[PDB]
Amino acid sequence: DIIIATKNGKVRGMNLTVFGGTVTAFLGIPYAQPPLGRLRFKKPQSLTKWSDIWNATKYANSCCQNIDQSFPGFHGSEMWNPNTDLSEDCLYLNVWIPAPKPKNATVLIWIYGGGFQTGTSSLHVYDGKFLARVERVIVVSMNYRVGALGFLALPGNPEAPGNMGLFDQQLALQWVQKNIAAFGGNPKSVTLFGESAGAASVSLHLLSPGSHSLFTRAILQSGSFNAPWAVTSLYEARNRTLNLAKLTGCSRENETEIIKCLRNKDPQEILLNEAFVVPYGTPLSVNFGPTVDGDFLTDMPDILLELGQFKKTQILVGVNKDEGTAFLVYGAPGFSKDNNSIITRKEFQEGLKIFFPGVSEFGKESILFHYTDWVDDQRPENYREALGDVVGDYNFICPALEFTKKFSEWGNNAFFYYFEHRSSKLPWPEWMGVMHGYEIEFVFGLPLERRDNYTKAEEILSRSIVKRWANFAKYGNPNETQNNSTSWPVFKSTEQKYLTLNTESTRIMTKLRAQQCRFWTSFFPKV
Amino acid sequence: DIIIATKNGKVRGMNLTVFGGTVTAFLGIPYAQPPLGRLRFKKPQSLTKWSDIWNATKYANSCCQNIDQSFPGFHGSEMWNPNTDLSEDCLYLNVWIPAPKPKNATVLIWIYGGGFQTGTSSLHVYDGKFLARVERVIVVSMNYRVGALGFLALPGNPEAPGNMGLFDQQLALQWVQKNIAAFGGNPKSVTLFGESAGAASVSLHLLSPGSHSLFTRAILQSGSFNAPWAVTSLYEARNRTLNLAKLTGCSRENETEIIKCLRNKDPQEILLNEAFVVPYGTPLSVNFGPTVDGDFLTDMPDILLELGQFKKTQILVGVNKDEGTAFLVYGAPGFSKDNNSIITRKEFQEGLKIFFPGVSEFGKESILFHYTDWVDDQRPENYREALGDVVGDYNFICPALEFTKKFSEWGNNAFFYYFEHRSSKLPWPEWMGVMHGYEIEFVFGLPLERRDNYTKAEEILSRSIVKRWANFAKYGNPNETQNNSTSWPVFKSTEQKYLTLNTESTRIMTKLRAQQCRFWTSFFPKV
Ligand SMILES: *[C@@H]1O[C@H](CO[C@@H]2O[C@@H](C)[C@@H](O)[C@@H](O)[C@@H]2O)[C@@H](O[C@@H]2O[C@H](CO)[C@@H](O)[C@H](O)[C@H]2NC(C)=O)[C@H](O)[C@H]1NC(C)=O
Ligand SMILES: *[C@@H]1O[C@H](CO[C@H]2O[C@@H](C)[C@@H](O)[C@@H](O)[C@@H]2O)[C@@H](O[C@@H]2O[C@H](CO)[C@@H](O)[C@H](O)[C@H]2NC(C)=O)[C@H](O)[C@H]1NC(C)=O
Ligand SMILES: *[C@@H]1O[C@H](CO[C@H]2O[C@@H](C)[C@@H](O)[C@@H](O)[C@@H]2O)[C@@H](O[C@@H]2O[C@H](CO)[C@@H](O)[C@H](O)[C@H]2NC(C)=O)[C@H](O)[C@H]1NC(C)=O
Ligand SMILES: *[C@@H]1O[C@H](CO[C@H]2O[C@@H](C)[C@@H](O)[C@@H](O)[C@@H]2O)[C@@H](O[C@@H]2O[C@H](CO)[C@@H](O)[C@H](O)[C@H]2NC(C)=O)[C@H](O)[C@H]1NC(C)=O
Ligand SMILES: C[NH+](C)CCN(C[C@@H]1CCCN(C2Cc3ccccc3C2)C1)C(=O)c1ccc2cccc(O)c2n1
Ligand SMILES: C[NH+](C)CCN(C[C@@H]1CCCN(C2Cc3ccccc3C2)C1)C(=O)c1ccc2cccc(O)c2n1
Ligand SMILES: C[NH+](C)CCN(C[C@@H]1CCCN(C2Cc3ccccc3C2)C1)C(=O)c1ccc2cccc(O)c2n1
Ligand SMILES: C[NH+](C)CCN(C[C@@H]1CCCN(C2Cc3ccccc3C2)C1)C(=O)c1ccc2cccc(O)c2n1
Ligand SMILES: *[C@@H]1O[C@H](CO)[C@@H](O[C@@H]2O[C@H](CO)[C@@H](O)[C@H](O)[C@H]2NC(C)=O)[C@H](O)[C@H]1NC(C)=O
Ligand SMILES: *[C@@H]1O[C@H](CO[C@H]2O[C@@H](C)[C@@H](O)[C@@H](O)[C@@H]2O)[C@@H](O)[C@H](O)[C@H]1NC(C)=O
Ligand SMILES: *[C@@H]1O[C@H](CO)[C@@H](O)[C@H](O)[C@H]1NC(C)=O
Ligand SMILES: *[C@@H]1O[C@H](CO)[C@@H](O)[C@H](O)[C@H]1NC(C)=O
Ligand SMILES: *[C@@H]1O[C@H](CO)[C@@H](O)[C@H](O)[C@H]1NC(C)=O
Ligand SMILES: *[C@@H]1O[C@H](CO)[C@@H](O)[C@H](O)[C@H]1NC(C)=O
Ligand SMILES: [Cl-]
């Protein structure tokens, strides 16, 4: 039996066996007041203590979110669906401490991605027990409000001020500050890591003064705040909150009145209107996301980033070889999960209208013009691969590289990785390649379980990546100093070096997607 | 009726139709007295003038040489076999002139390879008409003596001095100097290029003072004198010359008297015992090659290269991705052009004994130790590919990288390529990849013949290569300045940059097969 005295109640956790050892898990510890009724759409509220001992022995509630019903019965899309029960009462977090209890362990806080609309910490691919046993770190992950319940914004009005899901994560960060010493953790050695919208969340903690004292280092996997989907403007958030209010018949005009209307509406009524708040939509739509609230974010994040207004520390950033394929099968002509998905120049042209709906016909031609200069025209996949590269480059790879350059320019060590290994278990067809999201399994060390149908090489790669991530969390340098490994060099603005990750040969390369990222990061913003 | 007046007499060419244009061809101009009877085993004698008109309208005889008959009817091996009569009367050269006759055109002199035992200028892949047509350069090629008929050596004896096939080449370079202006060539703009033994020949012309005035620049494809096979030691030349005279049964004591025998026996008796002249032999055996003779070569070539004793000019150097596979299907256990040649570790250890015969078990152990550190031990091809890399890295790639380095260090511009495109018409099996010898057709512009079943992209590649080669010859810089090509940087000892060549995307990379070539160049010579 393991009880831990936290500053507001005793907490009892389980024991697991992992590769012939013990890891103590504490699943579902509450860190915030249930944000129900009158606390809905508000920042998370402190907690009231309990002399009751709490049984943190089961994954808690995922927060309210629509679910991916696009491929019923498909492991590829349903593995991202929530695996506990939806509820507004969902502001819990999990902890994983090694056994024997560590003395001063480094802490890894996971922040799940999605599109600020979906996600939960209880998914199998985020199971922190492997990292706790293999590397003797402490893994903490938390649930945070997503969708409108987490990011509906009426600016300045404290009844719905925006960025509630970010203050959820931030509050879970202070919990780890106040309590992780009781678990044998070092609050002065804390690394945030995250994927997709979790990665964009990690970058915004870098920019938010209230979070600066609550972590040490940052890891950003396939995402950053400067990605075109990650920050919704002050005007977009107004039209989007009014349109949601109309679509619930809550169109008051006293501002705090049209919120009290939504507080009484049903969570399911809000989830179903959410989709229809913007006219034209994309598979990368983020209808309620982070805004400039003047509290978590004091200014437009790209100004803060360009003018050096962020925590000075180490960052580890990277992307996958085919970030963009996943989004094609959710609404691009000729694209399907069961079809090798060769498309025509006209289908490629139609795909551009889908993903860049507001862009002019000039911009849609620029994209066509630049991405289409291959050599061999007698090969079918040109346009198919082209669109995946288009979407992956625009939405993830080029912003991620841009964040890393601007961050490194103020004298911080940055490390960039190019993850290019296709999962031997990947449920999606092979034409989709190394997909968005499908490096996470390797960070959490799932292939370290031999009874799991991963390659023995996938065990080696995942072991290597786990060590590189743990060395970065502990020591700020993501090297593997023992198995004759490729040295991972710093990313500097001048030469822009990055490490590739795969099972064949890990290489140092420079200037990843150099021509493409110039087109996106310099020319296209003028368009 | 195109007749040109060479300094030796009038010569009659012939018009060729090429790509809607005309190319004037002079095939088989004699450039020395036939090395017959008393001239056998001697440096080439000058040519006596002729009051006639010489009809240079067909290819001349190829020099005497054994022939590859391991794959009867197979184009892959037979395409390298001679396609004219064999004869000791073989000292002829070919000349391709653009039409209209050029004013002062750069001259490209080809030197064919083949381990100094085989080869001829008349092969289809050495057809110079496409270069004369597309880039309006003059192309010259010569036949030179091979095997013991061009490299039998007893140091000192001018009856059999050694390097007589190199002096053949040199005499052809001399012919171009005296006569090419009659055809519209610029004798001050002569680039040597060759492949394999031809490339190791070009490299020796760089180190040989007698040849320094006969050319301007140099191109070396898959070969250099510093390759393990390309220079015969005086100790070996001594044993091998003698061991031949015993195999033909006329060992004598007066050293000028044992040559008098060999000058009697007819060619086929010599060719029949050349192979048994060395005890154990490998597919990379060069029984009669270049030696240090104090005439063409005044010292050990490795010493001259190390101490800056060579013509100072630009060089273009490169290798193919899979230089070593061609040699495996000729005696390496487990390998055949007809099965996929998945070998096992025991067969790999046998392949090392085949290819490194007189090397200590220690040396064979470090080869096995260094080359087997792959990640995924559960891959069938590991040993198949490993042996190909062993043979490729030891015999071609590492010597070429070492030659380019040591050459660049004395102030001159060097350009290194890495050819990694597999011809769509390549007759050998797919596991052999980008084989030794199979960049030549792209350098000679065969894929520019649209009517020939090469892909459209292979035409685009072969065009870009042909322009780069021509620009190197004309201007010393192998860049492609018009069609947005990748800039080809200079090879410097510290950076070691090279350009990859393929149909997908040309990349600048650095330090090719660095870990492998550190083994072969630095450590292996000590064992
Ligand atoms: C590849 O498949 C897509 C989508 O197809 C799915 O699988 C098929 C077997 C079929 O049963 C479809 O109904 C499935 O949705 C094909 O897509 C076009 O896709 C759009 C998308 O809605 C659809 O409206 C069109 O009618 C489809 N066109 C046709 C002729 O069916 C795509 O054309 C297939 N391409 C190839 C090369 O096989
Ligand atoms: C800001 O909001 C308005 C509201 O548009 C309606 O659209 C529905 C999908 C739903 O959200 C409903 O609650 C809302 O009232 C947008 O006006 C629309 O713009 C499109 C494109 O210009 C027009 O075709 C529509 O006529 C119009 N909608 C209707 C039916 O009134 C407006 O576009 C939006 N501004 C943006 C995109 O920033
Ligand atoms: C230098 O030459 C001798 C000569 O060896 C004979 O080998 C035949 C294949 C043929 O060339 C014949 O004319 C010649 O006389 C080499 O001696 C041989 O060495 C091997 C290996 O050490 C022994 O197994 C043989 O007994 C011996 N040959 C015979 C039958 O006499 C000698 O090796 C060689 N030196 C080298 C390799 O540099
Ligand atoms: C690929 O082929 C090689 C070579 O085998 C030759 O001989 C016959 C079996 C013929 O059918 C043809 O396949 C080929 O020309 C096989 O390797 C081995 O070759 C050595 C040569 O000395 C023989 O000693 C072995 O018997 C032979 N192996 C076998 C199966 O007998 C090789 O096995 C094969 N590899 C495959 C199938 O992947
Ligand atoms: C680890 N991955 C991150 C999880 C999967 N995906 C991205 C995929 C691919 C295409 C978009 N479907 C969404 C599934 C879903 C569920 C409910 C409502 C809509 C949709 C479509 C899943 C996401 O959770 C996801 C969803 C939206 C995003 C928006 C912008 C950027 C992103 O990364 C986004 N990611
Ligand atoms: C770093 N390891 C221990 C080795 C696996 N090589 C190294 C490469 C892959 C195989 C070929 N050369 C050899 C280097 C060399 C030196 C002299 C002569 C020949 C050769 C060839 C070594 C990796 O790059 C690699 C790739 C992915 C990994 C993933 C997890 C863990 C690893 O160690 C990983 N290593
Ligand atoms: C353009 N290529 C260069 C022409 C072909 N080949 C290389 C191949 C490699 C495998 C062995 N076959 C034949 C074996 C054989 C048997 C009887 C008569 C001739 C041949 C060659 C040749 C060569 O002519 C060749 C031959 C010997 C070499 C020795 C050392 C280095 C080389 O590059 C060598 N190249
Ligand atoms: C220089 N050419 C004319 C073009 C072919 N590309 C260039 C690559 C091919 C793949 C796609 N990106 C584009 C660069 C870019 C910029 C903005 C947005 C998207 C993209 C993707 C360009 C070659 O690298 C190449 C490779 C082999 C060749 C062989 C012969 C002749 C050639 O031109 C060859 N060119
Ligand atoms: C945990 O490690 C931390 C530092 O990583 C230690 O706590 C502090 O130690 C630093 C030394 O770097 C001091 O400057 C601070 O003053 C210490 N903290 C405070 C609040 O004073 C500590 O030694 C370790 N704790 C363990 C092992 O229990
Ligand atoms: C060269 O050919 C001569 C006859 O053939 C040619 O005659 C030329 C005058 C011209 O018409 C060409 O078009 C013909 O092909 C022949 O008399 C000479 O003897 C030949 N020269 C040698 C050295 O044999
Ligand atoms: C916590 O779990 C243990 C299981 O043995 C139980 O004894 C205890 O009563 C539980 N506390 C609860 C459910 O409040
Ligand atoms: C290093 O390699 C050995 C296998 O040779 C493995 O057991 C060990 O876990 C590896 N360590 C890391 C950090 O990858
Ligand atoms: C050709 O060029 C050389 C120098 O490159 C020059 O000396 C010679 O006179 C020129 N001959 C011509 C143009 O006929
Ligand atoms: C330049 O582009 C044209 C247009 O297609 C092409 O025909 C030509 O071969 C290219 N030149 C080179 C040197 O590749
Ligand atoms: Cl790139």
PDB file of C-alpha atoms in Angstrom, chain B residues 111 166 169-170 173 190-194 197-221 223-226 295-318 399-400 402-408 410 412-415 472:
ATOM      1  CA  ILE B 111      40.189   6.386 -72.145  1.00  0.00           C
ATOM      2  CA  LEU B 166      50.129   4.054 -71.040  1.00  0.00           C
ATOM      3  CA  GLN B 169      47.564   6.549 -74.575  1.00  0.00           C
ATOM      4  CA  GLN B 170      50.231   9.240 -74.341  1.00  0.00           C
ATOM      5  CA  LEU B 173      47.304  12.584 -76.660  1.00  0.00           C
ATOM      6  CA  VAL B 190      41.730  19.157 -73.926  1.00  0.00           C
ATOM      7  CA  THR B 191      39.981  17.332 -71.080  1.00  0.00           C
ATOM      8  CA  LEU B 192      40.923  13.725 -70.405  1.00  0.00           C
ATOM      9  CA  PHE B 193      38.161  11.512 -69.119  1.00  0.00           C
ATOM     10  CA  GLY B 194      37.904   7.790 -68.480  1.00  0.00           C
ATOM     11  CA  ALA B 197      41.238   1.501 -65.492  1.00  0.00           C
ATOM     12  CA  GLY B 198      40.707   4.508 -67.754  1.00  0.00           C
ATOM     13  CA  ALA B 199      40.211   6.714 -64.706  1.00  0.00           C
ATOM     14  CA  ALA B 200      43.295   5.267 -63.018  1.00  0.00           C
ATOM     15  CA  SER B 201      45.041   6.005 -66.322  1.00  0.00           C
ATOM     16  CA  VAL B 202      43.959   9.664 -66.335  1.00  0.00           C
ATOM     17  CA  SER B 203      45.210   9.927 -62.755  1.00  0.00           C
ATOM     18  CA  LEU B 204      48.601   8.591 -63.840  1.00  0.00           C
ATOM     19  CA  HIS B 205      48.746  11.100 -66.701  1.00  0.00           C
ATOM     20  CA  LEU B 206      48.312  13.742 -63.979  1.00  0.00           C
ATOM     21  CA  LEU B 207      51.434  12.414 -62.212  1.00  0.00           C
ATOM     22  CA  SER B 208      53.519  11.916 -65.359  1.00  0.00           C
ATOM     23  CA  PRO B 209      55.638  14.833 -66.609  1.00  0.00           C
ATOM     24  CA  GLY B 210      55.669  13.597 -70.205  1.00  0.00           C
ATOM     25  CA  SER B 211      51.882  14.024 -70.344  1.00  0.00           C
ATOM     26  CA  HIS B 212      51.505  17.380 -68.552  1.00  0.00           C
ATOM     27  CA  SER B 213      51.607  19.458 -71.745  1.00  0.00           C
ATOM     28  CA  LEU B 214      49.240  17.108 -73.609  1.00  0.00           C
ATOM     29  CA  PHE B 215      46.003  17.953 -71.761  1.00  0.00           C
ATOM     30  CA  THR B 216      44.252  20.658 -69.713  1.00  0.00           C
ATOM     31  CA  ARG B 217      41.793  19.092 -67.247  1.00  0.00           C
ATOM     32  CA  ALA B 218      40.885  15.626 -66.066  1.00  0.00           C
ATOM     33  CA  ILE B 219      37.752  13.623 -65.230  1.00  0.00           C
ATOM     34  CA  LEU B 220      38.027  10.376 -63.247  1.00  0.00           C
ATOM     35  CA  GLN B 221      35.010   8.044 -63.084  1.00  0.00           C
ATOM     36  CA  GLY B 223      38.964   4.815 -60.571  1.00  0.00           C
ATOM     37  CA  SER B 224      42.350   6.244 -59.583  1.00  0.00           C
ATOM     38  CA  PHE B 225      45.950   5.055 -59.437  1.00  0.00           C
ATOM     39  CA  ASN B 226      45.687   4.740 -55.647  1.00  0.00           C
ATOM     40  CA  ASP B 295      60.035   6.764 -67.531  1.00  0.00           C
ATOM     41  CA  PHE B 296      56.277   7.274 -67.395  1.00  0.00           C
ATOM     42  CA  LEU B 297      56.432   7.032 -63.579  1.00  0.00           C
ATOM     43  CA  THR B 298      59.590   8.254 -61.855  1.00  0.00           C
ATOM     44  CA  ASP B 299      58.651   7.126 -58.328  1.00  0.00           C
ATOM     45  CA  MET B 300      55.888   5.391 -56.398  1.00  0.00           C
ATOM     46  CA  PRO B 301      52.688   7.217 -57.426  1.00  0.00           C
ATOM     47  CA  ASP B 302      51.371   7.332 -53.843  1.00  0.00           C
ATOM     48  CA  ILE B 303      54.540   9.276 -52.935  1.00  0.00           C
ATOM     49  CA  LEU B 304      54.135  11.743 -55.808  1.00  0.00           C
ATOM     50  CA  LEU B 305      50.480  12.377 -54.894  1.00  0.00           C
ATOM     51  CA  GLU B 306      51.294  12.847 -51.205  1.00  0.00           C
ATOM     52  CA  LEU B 307      54.091  15.345 -51.969  1.00  0.00           C
ATOM     53  CA  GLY B 308      52.323  17.500 -54.568  1.00  0.00           C
ATOM     54  CA  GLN B 309      54.239  16.156 -57.596  1.00  0.00           C
ATOM     55  CA  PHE B 310      51.536  16.389 -60.228  1.00  0.00           C
ATOM     56  CA  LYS B 311      50.003  18.622 -62.874  1.00  0.00           C
ATOM     57  CA  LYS B 312      48.041  21.394 -61.139  1.00  0.00           C
ATOM     58  CA  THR B 313      44.579  21.716 -62.688  1.00  0.00           C
ATOM     59  CA  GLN B 314      40.916  21.076 -62.037  1.00  0.00           C
ATOM     60  CA  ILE B 315      39.587  17.552 -61.553  1.00  0.00           C
ATOM     61  CA  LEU B 316      36.112  16.039 -61.605  1.00  0.00           C
ATOM     62  CA  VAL B 317      35.844  12.735 -59.721  1.00  0.00           C
ATOM     63  CA  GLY B 318      33.040  10.406 -58.779  1.00  0.00           C
ATOM     64  CA  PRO B 399      40.611   5.416 -53.099  1.00  0.00           C
ATOM     65  CA  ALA B 400      38.691   7.957 -55.189  1.00  0.00           C
ATOM     66  CA  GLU B 402      41.400   9.811 -50.936  1.00  0.00           C
ATOM     67  CA  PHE B 403      42.737  10.843 -54.349  1.00  0.00           C
ATOM     68  CA  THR B 404      40.405  13.840 -54.569  1.00  0.00           C
ATOM     69  CA  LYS B 405      41.367  14.937 -51.044  1.00  0.00           C
ATOM     70  CA  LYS B 406      45.136  14.670 -51.515  1.00  0.00           C
ATOM     71  CA  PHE B 407      44.796  16.348 -54.911  1.00  0.00           C
ATOM     72  CA  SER B 408      42.670  19.281 -53.678  1.00  0.00           C
ATOM     73  CA  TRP B 410      47.617  21.534 -53.244  1.00  0.00           C
ATOM     74  CA  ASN B 412      43.210  23.182 -57.114  1.00  0.00           C
ATOM     75  CA  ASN B 413      39.456  22.953 -57.506  1.00  0.00           C
ATOM     76  CA  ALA B 414      37.982  19.445 -57.305  1.00  0.00           C
ATOM     77  CA  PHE B 415      34.388  18.320 -57.803  1.00  0.00           C
ATOM     78  CA  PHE B 472      33.935  21.322 -66.798  1.00  0.00           C
TER      79      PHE B 472
END
